[PDB]
Amino acid sequence: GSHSMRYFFTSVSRPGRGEPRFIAVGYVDDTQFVRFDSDAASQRMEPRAPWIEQEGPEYWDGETRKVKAHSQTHRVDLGTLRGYYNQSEAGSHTVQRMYGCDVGSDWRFLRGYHQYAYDGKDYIALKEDLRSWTAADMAAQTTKHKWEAAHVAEQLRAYLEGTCVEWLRRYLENGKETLQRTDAPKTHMTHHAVSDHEATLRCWALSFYPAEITLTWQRDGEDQTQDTELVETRPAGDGTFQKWAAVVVPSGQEQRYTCHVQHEGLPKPLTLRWEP
């Protein structure tokens, strides 16, 4: 299957009450493997997946060094962005950064990422060519010219197309029993009357990994996209995922509706009808 390694960083300024709260998390697909919290006691990058624990002290020293440096950059960026937007010194603001790489099922490099957000909105992002920048507004154009002069893209591209991808392949191997598995969803359907003429049919998908799934309803082979209540895919908390999809049907016409389940664990997609 397709795989990814992504790092996520969030810095939230708290003026008057000290230095910004910095949080860094690392993921291989939908599994977190590292973490850093500026308010935690260790002041170290810590393991979060059993397959990363086997890395020696030099690995953790380097990760702790680079993660504290990432946090310092964001601390300075918070002050700058406040000036770019003529914002008050007392308010709390957020910078977010995301970067990483993807590999296809052939394990060859597919995509690199490096993007930045200020206060939950796009600020600057590296384009798919790993050479150009997309600046969201006028303030981001100042940063864009600064990063072009400093040749930031040339440096990021060497990491994304090489280092990022080599370490992702090594993590996929070290964690092969969890990272390279497919848990097919366990499905069921519930039925609840809502009037003398209507009932809700809820199609369930549970204990699946990875999170990528399609759960849809049809009535006589026609998509029910508008009449479908769908929940966002949620973590079970044990490394698996859950999702449901519901439709309001006329009682007696339950057999005209089919729920369709699509997942890597299912060789052939599933068609499910209400079973009284």
Partner: peptide, 10 residues
């Protein structure tokens, strides 16, 4: 592994 690069400020 994190990117071993001193980022440029905004």
């Amino acid at each position: 592994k994190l990117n071993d690069l001193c980022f440029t400020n905004v």
